[PDB]
Structures are given as structure tokens and as C-alpha cells.
Amino acid sequence: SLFELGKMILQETGKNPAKSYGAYGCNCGVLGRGKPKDATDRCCYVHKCCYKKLTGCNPKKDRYSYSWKDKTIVCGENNPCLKELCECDKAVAICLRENLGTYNKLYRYHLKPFCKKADDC
Amino acid sequence: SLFELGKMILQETGKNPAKSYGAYGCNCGVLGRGKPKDATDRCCYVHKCCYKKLTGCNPKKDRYSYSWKDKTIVCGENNPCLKELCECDKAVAICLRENLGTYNKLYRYHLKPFCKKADDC
Ligand SMILES: O=C(/C=C/c1ccc(O)c(O)c1)O[C@H](Cc1ccc(O)c(O)c1)C(=O)O
């Protein structure tokens, strides 16, 4: 769920996830996907496509178990859908941290309704 | 949908809705409800309660028509679900504006995991 996803982004990036990524670019936060603005935005595009393919569980609300071990996110077995979800969320937290160097505050709180249309996943 | 909601908040408040209201208090933005921290937060609590009566339309995804007449939000006769949805969004936009006087930036990007459990609507 968003609880686990936001915790992971905090553990990986050291950043408040809502402030930094609740509405960044065309793909981070609410409101679907759009052509990515930059590498950080592209992380969130891949993440939304990761969710789109999952079936059997709800990426928004379903909770799941994960551990922080040796400063690594380790997804608990859970059940297969929840483990795939934990893996989508892990991957985005890692991707966002990797791309902090080009994060651009201009795209924060971005105007999404003006975003170009996204290619299909 | 979130597009119409965001636009109404912008028109009423003159604030960027993602920045001011995307993660405010225990009730504004993602997740559910919780005990409200202040008046602005309580507007969002009322709004989430409003959405729970909706039958036959998705408050997040479903578009509907409204217009800005004499600096007033005017819901279009949509069908019954969408008109109610439009009325819910209008009311929260007005309430947020009416309570800008006590808006506290400290509640922005709040820790919503520790919010106390909401009372029944
Ligand atoms: O563990 C953390 C954060 C650890 C952390 C805090 C600040 C940092 O910069 C950092 O890299 C890691 O917060 C959790 C609480 C929490 C925060 C965000 C959430 O979405 C959540 O579900 C739980 C805790 O107290 O264990």
C-alpha cells in the first residue's frame, strides 16, 4: 500500500515522499502516466506500468510485509501478488534514490493535466 | 475526477492544490480519514464522508461537467452520481477557501500513519 511505498522511498532517498514525489512531473503521484519529464519521472512511469500488470491484489490499499536488512529492502514472502507489489515498490524507491542528482524542484507540484500522452506500457 | 477537483480548489483558493492540499493533515489527499487536525483538515474529512454515499460512479477517475459562472462553481446536470460527486468537490473547494485563515503549513506533507482513527461519518 502507500504506507509501505512511502516508507521505502523514505528509507532509500532520505526524502519526505509526499513532498518530493507526491506530485512530481507527469508520472509521480496521482493522475495516471504521461511522457516522462526526466529520469526521476521515468522511475514513476515504470512503477505505474508495474502496477498496471499486477492482478489479484490492490496496489493502493493492500498492506504487505517487508524488512530493512543490511540497508536493503527485503520483500517478505507474503502471497505472490503482494510480493510482486512489494517488488514494484522497492524498485521505484531504488530508482528515485539513484536519480536524486537530477531531481528538479521545478517539476514538483507539476501541472499534470498538461502532460503529453503516455505510450502504452 | 481529480482533474475537476483540483481545478475547483485552484479557482476557489488561488492555491496550487497538490502543494497545499495533496498531503495535508489526516484527511487531505491520499489514504482515508482520521481525526482532523484543524478546520482545513475537517473540510477534507467531510469530503471523504461525502464520497462514501456515491453509487455508480468513481470519484477519482470519472469526469463530469461544471462551469465557473460569476466566480461560482456551477455543477452541470450530469447523471445523479456525477452531480453528487460534483457537489461534493464543490463543497470541499469552498470549505478549503473559507478556512485559509487558519491554514497551517506545519500540517503540510503530514505523518498520516500516526493519525488517530476517524469517527463514523
Ligand atoms: O522508519 C522510518 C523512517 C526511517 C527513516 C527516516 C528518515 C530518513 O531520512 C530515513 O532514511 C529513514 O519511519 C517509519 C514510519 C513511517 C513513515 C512513512 C510511512 O509511510 C510509514 O508507513 C511509516 C518508522 O518510524 O519506522
Side-chain angles (χ1 to χ4, degrees), chain A residues 1-34 36-68 70-105 107-116 118-121, chain B residues 1-60 62-105 107-115 117-121:
Chain A
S1 76
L2 278 304
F3 291 103
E4 287 81 17
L5 168 63
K7 195 181 170 162
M8 292 185 185
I9 288 168
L10 182 64
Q11 290 169 129
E12 285 286 331
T13 66
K15 297 298 177 163
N16 173 307
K19 185 180 187 186
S20 282
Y21 301 107
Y24 190 98
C26 289
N27 301 270
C28 302
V30 305
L31 293 170
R33 287 181 315 118
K37 281 298 190 311
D38 68 0
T40 284
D41 207 10
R42 197 149 27 240
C43 301
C44 291
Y45 176 113
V46 165
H47 182 242
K48 280 178 180 182
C49 291
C50 199
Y51 273 10
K52 185 165 259 186
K53 90 188 153 298
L54 298 166
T55 75
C57 62
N58 160 28
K60 303 297 129 50
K61 222 92 124 38
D62 288 356
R63 311 293 307 257
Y64 56 78
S65 299
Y66 81 92
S67 287
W68 179 243
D70 293 325
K71 297 196 281 191
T72 303
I73 297 165
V74 176
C75 290
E77 279 294 348
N78 297 101
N79 60 220
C81 191
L82 292 181
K83 186 186 184 151
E84 288 186 6
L85 174 54
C86 179
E87 298 290 341
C88 290
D89 285 346
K90 174 178 173 177
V92 82
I94 289 165
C95 185
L96 290 175
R97 180 245 309 156
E98 290 174 332
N99 289 288
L100 284 168
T102 59
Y103 181 100
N104 184 344
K105 290 180 212 268
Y107 292 138
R108 204 185 256 181
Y109 320 121
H110 185 69
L111 263 77
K112 284 169 192 280
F114 291 92
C115 280
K116 225 143 206 45
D119 295 358
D120 328 53
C121 287
Chain B
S1 74
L2 256 2
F3 289 106
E4 293 79 11
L5 173 57
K7 191 176 183 186
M8 296 181 180
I9 292 172
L10 181 60
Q11 288 170 137
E12 289 281 328
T13 65
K15 307 282 184 199
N16 183 304
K19 190 185 178 181
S20 282
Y21 302 110
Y24 185 104
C26 287
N27 296 280
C28 302
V30 304
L31 274 339
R33 299 175 306 124
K35 181 173 204 170
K37 283 290 173 148
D38 64 3
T40 284
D41 203 15
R42 201 164 294 102
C43 299
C44 291
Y45 176 106
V46 174
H47 181 244
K48 278 164 174 186
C49 283
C50 192
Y51 269 12
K52 290 182 201 236
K53 79 213 174 146
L54 303 168
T55 295
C57 71
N58 193 306
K60 290 303 143 184
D62 293 353
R63 315 302 298 253
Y64 57 77
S65 304
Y66 82 92
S67 67
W68 179 241
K69 295 203 201 300
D70 186 45
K71 288 189 295 192
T72 305
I73 299 156
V74 183
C75 292
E77 268 274 49
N78 285 264
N79 71 48
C81 197
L82 293 170
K83 175 57 144 76
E84 298 171 354
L85 173 58
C86 184
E87 298 291 341
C88 290
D89 291 343
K90 169 178 181 170
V92 77
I94 290 165
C95 184
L96 292 174
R97 188 233 324 139
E98 290 175 336
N99 292 283
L100 283 163
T102 59
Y103 184 93
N104 186 342
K105 294 168 189 214
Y107 293 139
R108 198 190 272 184
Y109 328 116
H110 192 268
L111 257 286
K112 274 161 274 181
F114 300 114
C115 277
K117 203 177 238 81
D119 289 325
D120 344 24
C121 296

PDB file of all heavy atoms in Angstrom, chain A residues 2-7 10-15 17 63, chain B residues 111 113-114, ligand 1:
ATOM      1  N   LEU A   2       0.259   2.373  -0.043  1.00  0.00           N
ATOM      2  CA  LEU A   2       1.005   3.628   0.030  1.00  0.00           C
ATOM      3  C   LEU A   2       1.832   3.758   1.288  1.00  0.00           C
ATOM      4  O   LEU A   2       2.870   4.428   1.275  1.00  0.00           O
ATOM      5  CB  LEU A   2       0.019   4.820  -0.045  1.00  0.00           C
ATOM      6  CG  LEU A   2      -0.392   5.179  -1.474  1.00  0.00           C
ATOM      7  CD1 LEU A   2       0.744   5.479  -2.418  1.00  0.00           C
ATOM      8  CD2 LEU A   2      -1.336   4.126  -2.055  1.00  0.00           C
ATOM      9  N   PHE A   3       1.371   3.153   2.396  1.00  0.00           N
ATOM     10  CA  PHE A   3       2.180   3.164   3.639  1.00  0.00           C
ATOM     11  C   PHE A   3       3.564   2.554   3.389  1.00  0.00           C
ATOM     12  O   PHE A   3       4.595   3.155   3.751  1.00  0.00           O
ATOM     13  CB  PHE A   3       1.465   2.367   4.748  1.00  0.00           C
ATOM     14  CG  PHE A   3       0.198   3.033   5.243  1.00  0.00           C
ATOM     15  CD1 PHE A   3      -1.091   2.573   4.834  1.00  0.00           C
ATOM     16  CD2 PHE A   3       0.259   4.114   6.149  1.00  0.00           C
ATOM     17  CE1 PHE A   3      -2.256   3.188   5.325  1.00  0.00           C
ATOM     18  CE2 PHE A   3      -0.984   4.729   6.651  1.00  0.00           C
ATOM     19  CZ  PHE A   3      -2.182   4.251   6.218  1.00  0.00           C
ATOM     20  N   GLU A   4       3.602   1.333   2.831  1.00  0.00           N
ATOM     21  CA  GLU A   4       4.876   0.653   2.628  1.00  0.00           C
ATOM     22  C   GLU A   4       5.719   1.417   1.559  1.00  0.00           C
ATOM     23  O   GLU A   4       6.948   1.634   1.738  1.00  0.00           O
ATOM     24  CB  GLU A   4       4.658  -0.780   2.114  1.00  0.00           C
ATOM     25  CG  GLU A   4       4.114  -1.791   3.194  1.00  0.00           C
ATOM     26  CD  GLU A   4       2.593  -1.665   3.383  1.00  0.00           C
ATOM     27  OE1 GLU A   4       1.865  -1.082   2.534  1.00  0.00           O
ATOM     28  OE2 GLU A   4       2.086  -2.219   4.372  1.00  0.00           O
ATOM     29  N   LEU A   5       5.042   1.852   0.481  1.00  0.00           N
ATOM     30  CA  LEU A   5       5.739   2.548  -0.611  1.00  0.00           C
ATOM     31  C   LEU A   5       6.391   3.837  -0.093  1.00  0.00           C
ATOM     32  O   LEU A   5       7.587   4.145  -0.366  1.00  0.00           O
ATOM     33  CB  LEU A   5       4.722   2.903  -1.728  1.00  0.00           C
ATOM     34  CG  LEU A   5       5.256   3.890  -2.799  1.00  0.00           C
ATOM     35  CD1 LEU A   5       6.471   3.254  -3.566  1.00  0.00           C
ATOM     36  CD2 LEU A   5       4.119   4.263  -3.774  1.00  0.00           C
ATOM     37  N   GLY A   6       5.650   4.593   0.706  1.00  0.00           N
ATOM     38  CA  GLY A   6       6.214   5.814   1.224  1.00  0.00           C
ATOM     39  C   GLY A   6       7.353   5.567   2.213  1.00  0.00           C
ATOM     40  O   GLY A   6       8.389   6.275   2.187  1.00  0.00           O
ATOM     41  N   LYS A   7       7.212   4.546   3.052  1.00  0.00           N
ATOM     42  CA  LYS A   7       8.322   4.153   3.941  1.00  0.00           C
ATOM     43  C   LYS A   7       9.593   3.779   3.157  1.00  0.00           C
ATOM     44  O   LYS A   7      10.699   4.236   3.475  1.00  0.00           O
ATOM     45  CB  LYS A   7       7.893   3.063   4.892  1.00  0.00           C
ATOM     46  CG  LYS A   7       8.919   2.915   6.053  1.00  0.00           C
ATOM     47  CD  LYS A   7       8.471   1.767   6.997  1.00  0.00           C
ATOM     48  CE  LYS A   7       9.622   1.479   7.968  1.00  0.00           C
ATOM     49  NZ  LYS A   7       9.257   0.730   9.191  1.00  0.00           N
ATOM     50  N   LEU A  10      11.283   6.812   1.745  1.00  0.00           N
ATOM     51  CA  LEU A  10      11.993   7.499   2.821  1.00  0.00           C
ATOM     52  C   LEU A  10      13.329   6.757   3.176  1.00  0.00           C
ATOM     53  O   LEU A  10      14.402   7.395   3.312  1.00  0.00           O
ATOM     54  CB  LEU A  10      11.058   7.666   4.049  1.00  0.00           C
ATOM     55  CG  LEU A  10      11.677   8.420   5.248  1.00  0.00           C
ATOM     56  CD1 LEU A  10      12.003   9.869   4.846  1.00  0.00           C
ATOM     57  CD2 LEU A  10      10.690   8.334   6.464  1.00  0.00           C
ATOM     58  N   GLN A  11      13.262   5.440   3.313  1.00  0.00           N
ATOM     59  CA  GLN A  11      14.458   4.665   3.707  1.00  0.00           C
ATOM     60  C   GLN A  11      15.541   4.780   2.647  1.00  0.00           C
ATOM     61  O   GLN A  11      16.680   4.928   3.020  1.00  0.00           O
ATOM     62  CB  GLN A  11      14.120   3.193   3.935  1.00  0.00           C
ATOM     63  CG  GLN A  11      13.247   3.059   5.235  1.00  0.00           C
ATOM     64  CD  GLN A  11      12.624   1.606   5.388  1.00  0.00           C
ATOM     65  OE1 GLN A  11      12.748   1.019   6.392  1.00  0.00           O
ATOM     66  NE2 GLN A  11      12.083   1.068   4.348  1.00  0.00           N
ATOM     67  N   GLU A  12      15.142   4.722   1.352  1.00  0.00           N
ATOM     68  CA  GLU A  12      16.130   4.775   0.258  1.00  0.00           C
ATOM     69  C   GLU A  12      16.643   6.213   0.059  1.00  0.00           C
ATOM     70  O   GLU A  12      17.882   6.435  -0.005  1.00  0.00           O
ATOM     71  CB  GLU A  12      15.550   4.241  -1.060  1.00  0.00           C
ATOM     72  CG  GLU A  12      15.419   2.685  -1.127  1.00  0.00           C
ATOM     73  CD  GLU A  12      16.773   2.056  -1.306  1.00  0.00           C
ATOM     74  OE1 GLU A  12      17.645   2.721  -1.911  1.00  0.00           O
ATOM     75  OE2 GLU A  12      16.928   0.892  -0.867  1.00  0.00           O
ATOM     76  N   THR A  13      15.734   7.172  -0.100  1.00  0.00           N
ATOM     77  CA  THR A  13      16.139   8.529  -0.556  1.00  0.00           C
ATOM     78  C   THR A  13      16.498   9.461   0.593  1.00  0.00           C
ATOM     79  O   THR A  13      17.184  10.480   0.418  1.00  0.00           O
ATOM     80  CB  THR A  13      15.022   9.223  -1.367  1.00  0.00           C
ATOM     81  OG1 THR A  13      13.889   9.499  -0.526  1.00  0.00           O
ATOM     82  CG2 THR A  13      14.637   8.406  -2.578  1.00  0.00           C
ATOM     83  N   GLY A  14      15.957   9.223   1.853  1.00  0.00           N
ATOM     84  CA  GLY A  14      16.097  10.189   2.975  1.00  0.00           C
ATOM     85  C   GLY A  14      15.147  11.394   2.807  1.00  0.00           C
ATOM     86  O   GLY A  14      15.214  12.328   3.589  1.00  0.00           O
ATOM     87  N   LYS A  15      14.287  11.360   1.790  1.00  0.00           N
ATOM     88  CA  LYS A  15      13.370  12.470   1.492  1.00  0.00           C
ATOM     89  C   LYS A  15      11.948  12.200   1.923  1.00  0.00           C
ATOM     90  O   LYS A  15      11.516  11.082   1.787  1.00  0.00           O
ATOM     91  CB  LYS A  15      13.309  12.703  -0.021  1.00  0.00           C
ATOM     92  CG  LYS A  15      14.628  13.122  -0.691  1.00  0.00           C
ATOM     93  CD  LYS A  15      15.154  14.450  -0.154  1.00  0.00           C
ATOM     94  CE  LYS A  15      16.501  14.778  -0.812  1.00  0.00           C
ATOM     95  NZ  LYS A  15      16.877  16.231  -0.644  1.00  0.00           N
ATOM     96  N   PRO A  17       8.430  11.532   1.251  1.00  0.00           N
ATOM     97  CA  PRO A  17       7.935  11.097  -0.073  1.00  0.00           C
ATOM     98  C   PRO A  17       6.802  11.934  -0.621  1.00  0.00           C
ATOM     99  O   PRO A  17       6.780  12.235  -1.846  1.00  0.00           O
ATOM    100  CB  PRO A  17       7.498   9.627   0.162  1.00  0.00           C
ATOM    101  CG  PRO A  17       7.453   9.463   1.617  1.00  0.00           C
ATOM    102  CD  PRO A  17       8.409  10.436   2.231  1.00  0.00           C
ATOM    103  N   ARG A  63      -1.907  -4.025   2.367  1.00  0.00           N
ATOM    104  CA  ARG A  63      -0.631  -3.921   3.097  1.00  0.00           C
ATOM    105  C   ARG A  63       0.181  -5.194   2.818  1.00  0.00           C
ATOM    106  O   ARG A  63      -0.371  -6.230   2.432  1.00  0.00           O
ATOM    107  CB  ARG A  63      -0.905  -3.890   4.586  1.00  0.00           C
ATOM    108  CG  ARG A  63      -1.975  -2.918   5.029  1.00  0.00           C
ATOM    109  CD  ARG A  63      -1.560  -1.456   4.836  1.00  0.00           C
ATOM    110  NE  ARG A  63      -0.266  -1.177   5.455  1.00  0.00           N
ATOM    111  CZ  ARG A  63      -0.145  -0.536   6.605  1.00  0.00           C
ATOM    112  NH1 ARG A  63      -1.255  -0.139   7.275  1.00  0.00           N
ATOM    113  NH2 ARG A  63       1.058  -0.310   7.096  1.00  0.00           N
TER     114      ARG A  63
ATOM    115  N   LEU B 111       2.545  13.349   8.697  1.00  0.00           N
ATOM    116  CA  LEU B 111       2.698  11.911   9.048  1.00  0.00           C
ATOM    117  C   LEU B 111       1.406  11.152   9.264  1.00  0.00           C
ATOM    118  O   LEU B 111       1.007  10.882  10.440  1.00  0.00           O
ATOM    119  CB  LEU B 111       3.586  11.711  10.280  1.00  0.00           C
ATOM    120  CG  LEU B 111       5.035  11.232  10.049  1.00  0.00           C
ATOM    121  CD1 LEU B 111       5.060   9.742   9.663  1.00  0.00           C
ATOM    122  CD2 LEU B 111       5.831  12.128   9.052  1.00  0.00           C
ATOM    123  N   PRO B 113       0.429   8.012   8.860  1.00  0.00           N
ATOM    124  CA  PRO B 113       0.463   6.771   9.622  1.00  0.00           C
ATOM    125  C   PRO B 113       0.139   6.880  11.108  1.00  0.00           C
ATOM    126  O   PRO B 113      -0.309   5.902  11.625  1.00  0.00           O
ATOM    127  CB  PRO B 113       1.889   6.287   9.421  1.00  0.00           C
ATOM    128  CG  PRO B 113       2.537   7.273   8.574  1.00  0.00           C
ATOM    129  CD  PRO B 113       1.547   8.086   7.926  1.00  0.00           C
ATOM    130  N   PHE B 114       0.348   8.013  11.763  1.00  0.00           N
ATOM    131  CA  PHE B 114       0.036   8.148  13.180  1.00  0.00           C
ATOM    132  C   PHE B 114      -1.271   8.814  13.501  1.00  0.00           C
ATOM    133  O   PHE B 114      -1.600   8.927  14.636  1.00  0.00           O
ATOM    134  CB  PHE B 114       1.088   8.950  13.913  1.00  0.00           C
ATOM    135  CG  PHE B 114       2.422   8.373  13.843  1.00  0.00           C
ATOM    136  CD1 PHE B 114       3.416   9.017  13.185  1.00  0.00           C
ATOM    137  CD2 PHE B 114       2.678   7.169  14.426  1.00  0.00           C
ATOM    138  CE1 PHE B 114       4.631   8.498  13.127  1.00  0.00           C
ATOM    139  CE2 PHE B 114       3.890   6.636  14.356  1.00  0.00           C
ATOM    140  CZ  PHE B 114       4.876   7.297  13.704  1.00  0.00           C
TER     141      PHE B 114
HETATM  142  O1  LIG C   1      11.328   4.224   9.673  1.00  0.00           O
HETATM  143  C1  LIG C   1      11.013   5.349   9.289  1.00  0.00           C
HETATM  144  C2  LIG C   1      11.948   6.238   8.620  1.00  0.00           C
HETATM  145  C3  LIG C   1      13.226   5.932   8.706  1.00  0.00           C
HETATM  146  C4  LIG C   1      13.948   6.996   8.056  1.00  0.00           C
HETATM  147  C5  LIG C   1      13.692   8.315   8.488  1.00  0.00           C
HETATM  148  C6  LIG C   1      14.291   9.444   7.920  1.00  0.00           C
HETATM  149  C7  LIG C   1      15.212   9.092   6.927  1.00  0.00           C
HETATM  150  O2  LIG C   1      15.875  10.063   6.310  1.00  0.00           O
HETATM  151  C8  LIG C   1      15.480   7.696   6.541  1.00  0.00           C
HETATM  152  O3  LIG C   1      16.331   7.343   5.536  1.00  0.00           O
HETATM  153  C9  LIG C   1      14.834   6.645   7.131  1.00  0.00           C
HETATM  154  O4  LIG C   1       9.720   5.887   9.561  1.00  0.00           O
HETATM  155  C10 LIG C   1       8.841   4.820   9.940  1.00  0.00           C
HETATM  156  C11 LIG C   1       7.426   5.402   9.938  1.00  0.00           C
HETATM  157  C12 LIG C   1       6.712   5.510   8.579  1.00  0.00           C
HETATM  158  C13 LIG C   1       6.926   6.556   7.640  1.00  0.00           C
HETATM  159  C14 LIG C   1       6.333   6.663   6.420  1.00  0.00           C
HETATM  160  C15 LIG C   1       5.374   5.680   6.152  1.00  0.00           C
HETATM  161  O5  LIG C   1       4.636   5.614   5.013  1.00  0.00           O
HETATM  162  C16 LIG C   1       5.143   4.621   7.064  1.00  0.00           C
HETATM  163  O6  LIG C   1       4.174   3.741   6.716  1.00  0.00           O
HETATM  164  C17 LIG C   1       5.791   4.514   8.282  1.00  0.00           C
HETATM  165  C18 LIG C   1       9.360   4.397  11.260  1.00  0.00           C
HETATM  166  O7  LIG C   1       9.242   5.126  12.308  1.00  0.00           O
HETATM  167  O8  LIG C   1       9.991   3.290  11.308  1.00  0.00           O
END
